[PDB]
């Protein structure tokens, strides 16, 4: 599964909302990645996610591989919306 998003948060993706996003990813059996500006990290790894330094107005790409990948992508979409991060 693959989807691109636009970041709409004034502060980009950092701190507590980034933490909640990682926690959403971690619920799923699938392996899940976040990619910004040509660098891909494990979305279950908060260190990697913070390392990307994702700013306001970025385009990001989430990918998920596994048998619950669709659930994962829906849940991540929902978290990105609930946290005011991306659409």
From Swiss-Prot:
Modified residues (Phosphoserine): 11, 45
Alphabetical keyword list: Cytoplasm, Phosphoprotein, Phosphotransferase system, Sugar transport, Transcription, Transcription regulation, Transport
Domain HPr: 1-87
GO cellular component: cytoplasm
Main localization of the protein described in the UniProt heading: cytoplasm
CDD domains: PTS-HPr_like
Gene3D superfamilies hit by this protein: HPr-like
Compartmental location: Cytoplasm
Cystine bridges: none
InterPro entries: HPr, HPr-like, HPr-like_sf, PTS_HPr_His_P_site, PTS_HPr_Ser_P_site
Coiled-coil regions listed in the entry: none
GO biological process: phosphoenolpyruvate-dependent sugar phosphotransferase system
Pfam families named in the record: PTS-HPr
Residues at the catalytic site: 14
Regulation affecting activity: Phosphorylation on Ser-45 inhibits the phosphoryl transfer from enzyme I to HPr.
Family from the record: Belongs to the HPr family.
UniProt-listed NCBIfam families: PRK13780.1 (NF010352), PTS_HPr_family (TIGR01003)
Task performed by this protein: General (non sugar-specific) component of the phosphoenolpyruvate-dependent sugar phosphotransferase system (sugar PTS). This major carbohydrate active-transport system catalyzes the phosphorylation of incoming sugar substrates concomitantly with their translocation across the cell membrane. The phosphoryl group from phosphoenolpyruvate (PEP) is transferred to the phosphoryl carrier protein HPr by enzyme I. Phospho-HPr then transfers it to the PTS EIIA domain.
Protein name stated in the entry: Phosphocarrier protein HPr
Species whose genome carries this gene: Geobacillus stearothermophilus
């Amino acid at each position: 599964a693959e989807k691109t998003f636009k970041v709409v948060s004034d502060s980009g993706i950092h701190a507590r909302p980034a933490t909640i996003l990682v926690q959403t990813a971690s619920k799923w059996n699938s392996e899940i990645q976040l990619e910004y500006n040509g660098k891909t990290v494990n979305l279950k790894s908060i260190m990697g996610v913070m390392s990307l330094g994702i700013p306001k107005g970025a385009t990001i790409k989430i990918t998920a591989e596994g048998a619950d990948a669709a659930e994962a992508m829906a849940a991540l979409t929902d978290t990105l919306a609930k946290e005011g991060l991306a659409e």
